[PDB]
Amino acid sequence: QLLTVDAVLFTYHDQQLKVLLVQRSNHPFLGLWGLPGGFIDETCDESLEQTVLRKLAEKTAVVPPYIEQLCTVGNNSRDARGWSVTVCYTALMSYQACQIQIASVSDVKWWPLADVLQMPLAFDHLQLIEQARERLTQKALYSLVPGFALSEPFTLPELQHVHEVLLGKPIQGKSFRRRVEQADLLIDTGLKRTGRPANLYCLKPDTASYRFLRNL
Amino acid sequence: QLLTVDAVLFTYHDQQLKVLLVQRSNHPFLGLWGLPGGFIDETCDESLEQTVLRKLAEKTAVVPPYIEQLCTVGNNSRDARGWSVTVCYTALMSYQACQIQIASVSDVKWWPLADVLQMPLAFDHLQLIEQARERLTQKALYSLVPGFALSEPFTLPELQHVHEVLLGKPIQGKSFRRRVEQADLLIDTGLKRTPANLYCLKPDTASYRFLRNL
Numbered sequence: 462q463l464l465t466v467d468a469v470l471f472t473y474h475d476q477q478l479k480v481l482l483v484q485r486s487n488h489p490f491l492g493l494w495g496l497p498g499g500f501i502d503e504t505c506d507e508s509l510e511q512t513v514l515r516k517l518a519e520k521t522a523v524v525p526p527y528i529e530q531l532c533t534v535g536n537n538s539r540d541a542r543g544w545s546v547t548v549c550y551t552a553l554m555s556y557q558a559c560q561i562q563i564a565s566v567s568d569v570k571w572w573p574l575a576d577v578l579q580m581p582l583a584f585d586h587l588q589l590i591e592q593a594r595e596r597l598t599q600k601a602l603y604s605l606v607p608g609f610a611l612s613e614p615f616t617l618p619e620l621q622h623v624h625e626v627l628l629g630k631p632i633q634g635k636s637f638r639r640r641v642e643q644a645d646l647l648i649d650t651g652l653k654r655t656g657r658p659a660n661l662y663c664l665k666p667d668t669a670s671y672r673f674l675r676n677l
Numbered sequence: 678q679l680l681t682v683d684a685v686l687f688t689y690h691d692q693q694l695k696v697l698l699v700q701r702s703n704h705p706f707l708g709l710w711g712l713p714g715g716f717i718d719e720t721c722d723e724s725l726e727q728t729v730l731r732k733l734a735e736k737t738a739v740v741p742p743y744i745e746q747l748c749t750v751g752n753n754s755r756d757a758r759g760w761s762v763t764v765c766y767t768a769l770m771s772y773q774a775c776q777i778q779i780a781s782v783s784d785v786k787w788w789p790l791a792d793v794l795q796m797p798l799a800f801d802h803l804q805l806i807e808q809a810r811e812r813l814t815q816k817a818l819y820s821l822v823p824g825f826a827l828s829e830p831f832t833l834p835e836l837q838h839v840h841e842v843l844l845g846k847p848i849q850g851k852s853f854r855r856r857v858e859q860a861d862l863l864i865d866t867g868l869k870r871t872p873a874n875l876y877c878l879k880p881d882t883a884s885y886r887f888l889r890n891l
């Protein structure tokens with residue numbers, strides 16, 4: 462079987478969800494945009510995660526701070542060359558961590574999600590994006606994983622807004638703050654960003670695994 | 678890469694969770710117990726789900742009422758031969774639907790989960806079983822999917838109890854039944870068992886999730 466690993470890497474910028482895409486310099490679906498991803502390299506990859514982090518770093522020059530397996534798709538119809546299997550990951554990083562290393566490259570671009578949803582993407586990659594986007598919605602409901610799409614440190618209004626974008630729905634500021642404070646997942650830097658001086662926070666590592674039992 | 682699919686199939690019987698294991702007849706780990714699973718056959722499988730259903734049916738003679746993809750494990754250390762990838766599924770079925778078939782087969786059997794968790798198993802199948810058990814705990818928190826591990830029709834107490842076993846603690850008998858009745862997932866057969874109601878799962882039980890934890 463044709464066995465690949467792919468990643469839907471999201472960030473948040475100006476002021477929408479953006480998804481990292483790579484133009485296919487390679488037949489089939491040649492010249493079309495699609496997910497970063499590809500083949501396992503046994504000489505440098507020791508696990509599937511190392512495979513997907515390498516494929517991301519080959520494009521961004523950064524290992525993203527958040528990554529999680531989404532799904533594995535495999536069947537005899539998604540790819541014209543043969544039965545193929547793709548292990549798909551979701552990732553999150555901040556926009557400026559790698560826009561500094563990605564301006565200078567023409568086959569790698571951050572695309573507005575809305576734009577992407579109207580594009581002719583290679584293979585079944587549109588469908589993988591939709592699945593990733595939907596899992597992100599659940600992350601907005603049960604975690605602070607959306608914080609990984611922001612540059613560090615961030616304000617709590619920033620964090621709230623990313624969650625609102627994902628749920629497509631204004632959310633209840635004071636409930637949110639209450640849940641954040643009790644999760645005990647943010648480090649208050651003691652710094653301020655100012656028409657009000659807002660506290661600047663970093664994510665604790667354990668944000669990645671922490672889940673609220675009740676929805677937002 | 679060696680590419681397989683595996684399934685961790687659970688059921689509920691004798692007030693305990695069981696897991697289906699299959700005894701290996703070939704190397705490596707020849708003679709070790711492990712998950713049902715193996716290679717894609719492009720001649721009969723059109724998708725990964727068809728592969729794993731075949732791997733299970735080959736052993737149980739029964740297509741399970743519930744199956745969900747769990748995770749894909751791939752590394753150069755779970756198999757001594759080299760780089761190895763396995764797409765794992767979780768599945769649930771009733772004990773009685775396949776016990777009557779696997780009773781007669783020496784290399785396939787339901788094992789007590791608590792015992793299996795302490796066993797030497799083929800490859801990394803113990804880790805796979807642990808991760809599936811963990812995932813089932815979430816199902817107990819957010820769905821009625823644990824019902825698929827029961828013979829149909831079943832009673833509410835019977836249903837509440839598999840959730841309790843999965844959760845590892847008792848549960849409020851009034852808030853559960855409230856939860857269940859608002860979800861609208863059970864069909865009342867109008868039939869009774871000692872006089873507790875007997876219910877069937879609605880097919881959409883597989884996909885319905887509760888917003889609030891149990």
Ligand code: NA
Pocket residue numbers: 563564565566567568569570571
């Ligand atoms: Na670029």
Ligand code: NA
Pocket residue numbers: 779780781782783784785786
């Ligand atoms: Na047997």
